[PDB]
Write a protein that binds this ligand. Structure first.
Ligand code: PC1
Ligand code: 3PE
Ligand code: 3PE
Ligand code: EHZ
Lengths: 125, 68, 32, 87, 412, 178, 76, 48
């Protein structure tokens, strides 16, 4: 049986709902076309309008950008799962690589000090 | 004009003299070359050196001594 | 030209707010 | 490369194919003749017709636009409109 | 050699089934594939409340004049509703066969739901439910269905919650009526002194024109429910006796090992001990219900579980032969009279799609031996999570770990 | 692409649109024409039977098991035409389909040549502005009473009027600017 | 204007469609679109193409040429 | 998956015991071997 994953989702066909539709469902479906038809006949009468120079705005895109870069911090509440996860992300790797670079830089320095690193034909740096 | 090679509907497209001759030409030279080289140089399959049977070398030849 | 009324706001707490937002976003109130 | 279509060469091919479908009589096929109410074919045979046309002219008549290729003529202007033939 | 059950089909899908016999009285009924399983929690009492409203008058026969007609020939009018099927049946004489069919036609279509009646039947239904709680075994079996089929439409009761009962309107009912009363989901079953050709002509005359298509290609499909192993315990220590039901998942209507499971029930300390195999569309509840004093409950449970494990492990040929004989007697003695024969015809056409004759039942009984009985019992009883429903003084009723551990043996 | 999408799909259009995907996904597995024209008239049989089922429930139970039979018996790389969505030439020539409102910013020198072209273009632009009023009014006078509203737009219904909202279905970039 | 071959010309007999036609027929079925798929097998493209034929295209003259050349070398 | 296992060696208690006993019989071999590897290596150069 096809098994939708968050990716490779369940196709339209093979979706239980698409097959058993109640009167309620149909009504809802019909309504959703109305909203779209309505919105469709607003764009079309603003797109096909002679005598227009102004920019059709597509406010649905303006509600999207505002929601995504200027409606974020006004809807921030510091919880757990947010500050624990908001510190593992900023200081986690930043502390990981420090013990990655310190250990390497220290290994290098020791070896140079003791006289093992070859540093041959290296006349540049 | 608009027709350099009349299109055809449900029929075998007519072919120009040149299309057939050039096609047979390239293929025939391929076969002349394969045959010519095979005759002059047949060492493509056979190889001109015969594998020795490693299992027929008198132990003497291989320095195999006789159990001291 | 787009009043804040027509731009995103806070989490719809009461059910009337959950139905007001659904208008802003041109959705069906039962799909928001 | 090939020559462009015409509103009478996109009509002779559409009638041609259909005249080769056994169910559709080849002497009662007239361009203004509906497939399901006048010729007799069923619903499943509309899909089969359209598909022939999609393979005679090499393009796909979308589902929603092809649930209506009823008249044997709609097919002749829809194909042409989709291919920009102003005759 | 019983007169075979002959089945015809109208265009609409109304299967007209009949089983002729010499008796002069007949049981003509209509069976509809519509129950509480097809309800969507917003109309949870629509079938029950329509079953109350269906005898209170139609458009052609307004009010009690309708039931005056079924008094006039001395016929009996009954209806019932389960989680999957609804039945409207009439017991009458043979010579009154046409008008009865016409009466049934009104009851399924052209029915009239009076708003006045709706309030009166709401008070009837509400009150009955308010007193239905009195019947314990009904409470225990409803609890067992709820805890075994949690989150599915098979948990909800036939009557529905008082809430919906109060909150129901003609239009809603109209919907359930117009949605779940389709002609292909309907069987007109007749048993007794009826002729099949006359009944077919009467079904063609009345009861054609029953809807066969949904409002908006809104086909109401069904999804196999999910059995859930769990234990619901309603404790009320003032009751004198305790009722406990323990069940596992059943196979369904179409699975033949049901027959074998029935033999197992025929093989099986509490004042009352009853075994059940309730079957729905590819699901069911197979188990036991016992009603006992508090201080015995745990011992009963232990007893009962031992018997199940014995049927999974140590079934012998003599008890299998006894269970086969008990099942043969049960089937033939149940198929006696026009009403149970008509009931069997309606359920057989709704569930199996055909009337299984008694010879096929006898063949499926005689092919059952001890080895396949303990195999099927190990398939359905051994190491399975049960659903437990208790009501009464049920403190000594063991919790779920002890019952689950009693569902298997350490010695096999 | 031309006609508008229906809100919900019927039973039929779902069945009859499988007959297409199915038969067309049978010509990937069965490439040769003969094998196909054989293995396919056998397909219709499958759809031909179970045609007159009146029991909707059943019908929607044959359909739901057909589309799962199909999903598991489909070809990974079917034959999708060259110019159709998902194809090999889909939207290839779109780099040459400029939107025609761009010939309005041409330098008077450029439009100097190609002159009769712009003489006819100015006629059509007069047609467009000459009817926007009668059109929008039509679109509105004939707007549906409150309720179901689909994306279907009305025809003309009067002489001289032009089908409402016709400037972008006509004046649409040529399919293959070549 | 381009003409089009007479629709009648096409017939299923004489082509692999005919054998498909006869079996589907045993099943009682009959495919109605065969004739359309006839020109595939009808003419020009009617001959079966064998795999050696393609690999060996032009071999006849190629070897002929091989002979001639070897000959010239023999003639020195 | 485990299903196959369960239905075969983990559902019948007798078999449950069988799988346990047999596994334990071999586990010791593996555990001792693996454990020793760990301990000895930790102290390699000091043993004997
Ligand atoms: C330490 C473990 C303590 C476990 C306590 C308990 O609850 O019982 C475990 C469980 C409790 O039951 P259970 O339900 O957790 O698991 C039982 C598994 N089946 C169903 C197959 C029986 O009991 C057992 O596992 C009994 C196992 C007997 C093994 C006998 C042979 C041992 C060989 C050793 C070598
Ligand atoms: C192992 C992981 C260790 C991680 C250590 C750092 C994270 C510590 C997390 C402490 C969580 C405290 C808490 O209860 O949640 C958020 C805290 C209280 O939340 P609340 O009570 O809802 O009130 C918030 C103000 N309205 O609200 C606050 O305390 C706000 C300040 C949060 C400070 C901790 C997170 C700092 C992240 C810095 C990221 C830099 C980039
Ligand atoms: C993407 C390709 C990655 C390819 C990696 C290739 C690795 C090559 C082998 C590296 C390890 C052996 C090196 C031997 C010679 C160098 C010896 C040396 O001086 O390296 C020391 C360094 C120590 O690192 P660590 O193990 O953290 O030690 C911390 C001790 N307290 O030793 C190490 O750094 C060990 C870890 C090496 C790899 C580090 C991670 C590389 C990829 C990082 C991607 C981004 C990760 C972000 C993580 C965020 C976490 C919140
Ligand atoms: C690539 C692999 C292909 C595999 C596809 C899969 O096998 C499909 C198959 O063969 S199984 C077809 C059975 N499909 C039905 O059974 C639907 C029946 N649906 C009805 O009968 C309707 O009620 C109605 C009366 C409207 C039909 O009318 P209509 O002809 O659609 O117009």
């Amino acid at each position: 049986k096809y098994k939708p994953a968050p990716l490779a989702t369940l196709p339209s066909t093979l979706d239980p709902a698409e097959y058993d539709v109640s009167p309620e469902t149909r009504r809802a479906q019909v309504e959703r076309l109305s909203i779209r038809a309505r919105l469709k006949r607003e764009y079309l009468l603003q797109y096909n309008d002679p005598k227009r120079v102004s920019h059709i705005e597509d406010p649905a895109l303006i509600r999207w950008t505002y929601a995504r870069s200027a409606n974020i911090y006004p809807n921030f509440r510091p919880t757990p799962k947010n500050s624990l996860l908001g510190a593992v992300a900023g200081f986690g790797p930043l502390i990981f690589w420090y013990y990655v670079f310190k250990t390497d830089r220290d290994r290098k320095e020791r070896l140079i000090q003791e006289g093992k690193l070859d540093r041959k034909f290296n006349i540049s740096y | 004009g608009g027709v350099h090679i009349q299109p055809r509907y449900r029929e075998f497209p007519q072919l120009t003299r040149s299309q057939v001759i050039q096609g047979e030409f390239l293929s025939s030279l391929m076969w002349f070359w394969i045959l010519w080289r095979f005759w002059h140089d047949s060492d493509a399959v056979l190889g001109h050196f015969s594998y020795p049977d490693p299992s027929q070398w008198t132990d003497e030849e291989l320095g195999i001594p006789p159990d001291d | 030209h787009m009043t804040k009324d027509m731009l995103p706001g806070s989490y719809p707490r009461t059910p009337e707010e959950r139905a007001a937002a659904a208008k802003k976003y041109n959705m069906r109130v039962e799909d928001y | 490369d090939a020559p462009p279509l015409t509103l009478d060469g996109i009509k002779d091919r559409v009638l041609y194919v259909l005249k080769l479908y056994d169910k559709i009589d080849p002497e009662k096929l007239s361009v203004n003749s509906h497939f399901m109410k006048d010729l007799g074919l069923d619903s499943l045979d509309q899909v089969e017709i359209i598909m022939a046309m999609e393979d005679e002219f090499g393009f796909e008549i979308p589902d929603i636009d092809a649930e209506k290729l009823m008249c044997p003529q709609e097919i002749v202007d829809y194909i042409a409109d989709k291919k920009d033939v102003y005759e | 050699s019983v007169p075979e059950t002959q089945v015809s089909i109208l265009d609409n899908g109304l299967r007209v089934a009949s089983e002729q016999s010499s008796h002069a009285t007949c049981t003509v009924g209509v069976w509809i594939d519509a129950g509480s399983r097809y309800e969507t929690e917003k109309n949870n009492g629509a079938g029950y409340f329509l079953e109350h409203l269906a005898f209170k008058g139609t458009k052609n026969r307004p009010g009690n004049a309708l039931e005056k007609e079924v008094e006039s020939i001395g016929a009996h009018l009954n209806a019932y509703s389960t989680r999957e099927h609804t039945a409207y049946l009439i017991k009458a004489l043979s010579k009154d066969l046409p008008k009865v069919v016409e009466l049934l036609a009104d009851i399924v279509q052209n029915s009239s739901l009076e708003d006045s009646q709706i309030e009166k039947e709401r008070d009837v239904i509400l009150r009955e439910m308010q007193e239905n709680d009195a019947s314990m075994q009904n409470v225990v079996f409803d609890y067992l269905h709820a805890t075994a089929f949690q989150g599915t439409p098979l948990a909800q009761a036939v009557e529905g919650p008082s809430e919906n009962v109060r909150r129901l309107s003609r239009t809603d009912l109209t919907d359930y009526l117009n949605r779940h009363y389709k002609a292909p989901r309907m069987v007109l079953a007749a048993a007794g002194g009826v002729e099949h050709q006359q009944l077919l002509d009467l079904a063609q005359k009345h009861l054609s024109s029953v809807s066969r298509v949904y409002e908006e290609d809104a086909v109401p499909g069904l999804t196999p429910c999910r059995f859930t192993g769990s234990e619901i315990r309603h404790r009320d220590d003032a009751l004198p006796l305790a009722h406990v039901a323990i069940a596992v998942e059943g196979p369904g209507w179409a699975n033949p090992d049901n027959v074998t499971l029935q033999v197992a029930n025929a093989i099986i300390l509490c004042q009352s001990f009853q075994t059940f195999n309730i079957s729905y569309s590819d699901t069911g509840l197979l188990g036991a219900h016992f009603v006992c004093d508090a201080m015995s409950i745990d011992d009963m449970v232990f007893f009962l579980q031992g018997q199940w494990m014995r049927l999974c492990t140590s079934a012998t040929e003599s008890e299998v032969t006894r269970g086969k004989n008990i099942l043969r007697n049960a089937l033939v003695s149940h198929l006696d009279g026009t009403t149970p024969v008509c009931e069997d015809i309606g359920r057989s056409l709704l569930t199996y799609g055909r009337r299984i004759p008694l010879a096929e039942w006898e063949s499926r009984i005689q092919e059952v031996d001890a080895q396949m009985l303990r195999d099927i019992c190990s398939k359905y009883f051994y190491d399975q999570c049960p659903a437990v429903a208790g009501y009464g003084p049920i403190e000594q009723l063991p919790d779920y770990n002890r019952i689950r551990s009693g569902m298997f043996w350490l010695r096999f | 692409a031309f006609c508008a999408p229906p809100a919900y799909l019927t039973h039929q259009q779902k069945v009859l649109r499988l007959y297409k995907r199915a038969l067309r996904h049978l010509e990937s597995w069965c490439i040769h024409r003969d094998k196909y024209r054989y293995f396919a008239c056998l397909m219709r049989a499958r759809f031909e039977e179970h045609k007159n089922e009146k029991d909707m429930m059943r019908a929607t139970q044959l359909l739901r098991e057909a589309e799962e039979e199909f999903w598991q018996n489909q070809h990974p790389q079917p034959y999708i035409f060259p110019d159709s969505p998902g194809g090999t030439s889909f939207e290839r020539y779109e780099c040459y389909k400029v939107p025609e409102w761009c010939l309005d910013y041409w330098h008077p020198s450029e439009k100097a040549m190609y002159p009769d072209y712009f003489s006819k273009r100015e006629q059509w632009k007069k047609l467009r502005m000459e009817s926007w009023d009668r059109e929008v009014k039509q679109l509105q006078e004939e707007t549906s009473p409150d309720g179901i509203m689909t994306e279907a737009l009305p025809p003309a219904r009067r002489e001289g009027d032009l089908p409402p909202l016709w400037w972008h279905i006509v004046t649409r970039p040529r399919e293959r600017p070549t | 204007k381009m003409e089009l071959p007479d629709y009648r010309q096409w017939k299923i007999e004489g082509t692999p469609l005919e054998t498909v036609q006869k079996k589907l027929a045993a099943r009682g079925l009959r495919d109605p679109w065969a004739r359309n798929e006839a020109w595939r097998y009808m003419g020009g493209f009617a001959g079966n193409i064998t795999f050696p034929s393609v690999i060996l295209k032009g071999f006849k003259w190629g070897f002929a040429a091989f002979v001639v050349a070897l000959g010239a070398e023999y003639f020195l | 998956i485990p299903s196959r296992l369960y239905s075969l060696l983990f559902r019948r208690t007798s078999t449950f015991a069988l799988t346990i006993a047999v596994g334990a019989l071999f586990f010791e071999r593996a555990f001792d071997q693996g454990a020793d590897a760990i301990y000895e290596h930790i102290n390699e150069g000091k043993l004997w």
